[PDB]
Design a protein. Structure first.
Lengths: 64, 61, 69, 70
């Protein structure tokens, strides 16, 4: 009988199908992390800039 | 034989991409910890500004 | 062919080892992103809170100016 | 004897490889889902920051005038 050989082939078939999807997911995940990293960099800078502006105006108001 | 070798090659490539991704998510985590700290600062400063402005509003009144 | 089935088995073991590493990477990635969710939640909340206070603060400076004039 | 044993071993190996691959896929799909959700949250953050920039411009000018009036 060829039962074990056939199962090896069928298991490899399924492993190949999933593997294809894993590769696509890894690539997509990388691109998304790339995109979000630049977004996070900008968020950090903007947050800091706002914080400074707020402290400045708070100090100015204190004197009024 | 060739199908299995091709599969191995694809899996090895995917491991490489995922190792890259792990390094990237660490960079993302570091950035998020920093932004959380700064967003906390921002909330505090915003509240402080609100209060200070209110105090001037009452003063001018 | 015992040699041939033995050789293929060695290829399959290699595949299994590589998949084990790959699965560990996907697992670790998921965990790290779950952890990072905490940060994103707090950031969203703080920035939202900040925006509302700034809006209130500007409102106060407007009324202050109205009086000072 | 040894051929049958080796083939049985190969079957068991491929079964485990498939099981792990399916586990990896679940994890990866969850990860993308979460990254998408977090992207949406960060979009909200981005909008709020943009709004605060505008409000700080207004605040700068009101504070400036207040100082002039005192």
């Amino acid at each position: 009988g060829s039962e074990m050989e056939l199962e090896i082939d069928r298991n490899l078939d399924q492993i190949q199908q999933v593997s294809n999807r894993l590769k696509k997911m890894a690539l997509t995940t990388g691109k998304e992390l790339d995109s979000q990293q630049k977004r996070l960099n900008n968020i950090e800078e903007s947050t800091d800039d706002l914080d400074i502006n707020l402290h400045m105006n708070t100090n100015r108001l204190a004197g009024i | 034989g060739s199908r299995t070798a091709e599969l191995q090659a694809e899996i090895d490539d995917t491991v490489g991409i995922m190792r890259d991704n792990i390094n990237k998510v660490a960079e993302r985590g570091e950035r998020l910890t920093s932004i959380e700290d700064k967003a906390d600062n921002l909330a505090v400063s915003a509240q402080g500004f609100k209060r200070g402005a209110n105090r001037v509003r009452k003063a001018m009144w | 062919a015992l040699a041939e089935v033995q050789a293929r088995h060695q290829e399959l073991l290699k595949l299994e080892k590589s998949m084990a590493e790959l699965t560990q990477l996907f697992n670790d990635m998921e965990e790290l992103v779950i952890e990072q969710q905490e940060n994103v939640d707090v950031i969203d909340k703080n920035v939202e809170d900040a925006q509302l206070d700034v809006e209130q603060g500007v409102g106060h400076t407007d009324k202050a100016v109205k009086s000072a004039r | 004897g040894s051929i049958k044993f080796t083939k049985q071993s190969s079957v068991a190996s491929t079964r485990n490889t498939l099981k792990m691959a399916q586990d990896a896929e679940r994890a990866g799909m969850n990860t993308l889902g979460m990254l998408g959700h977090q992207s949406e949250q960060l979009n909200n953050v981005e909008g709020n920051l943009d709004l605060m920039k505008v409000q700080n411009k207004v605040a700068d000018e009101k504070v400036a005038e207040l100082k002039k009036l005192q």
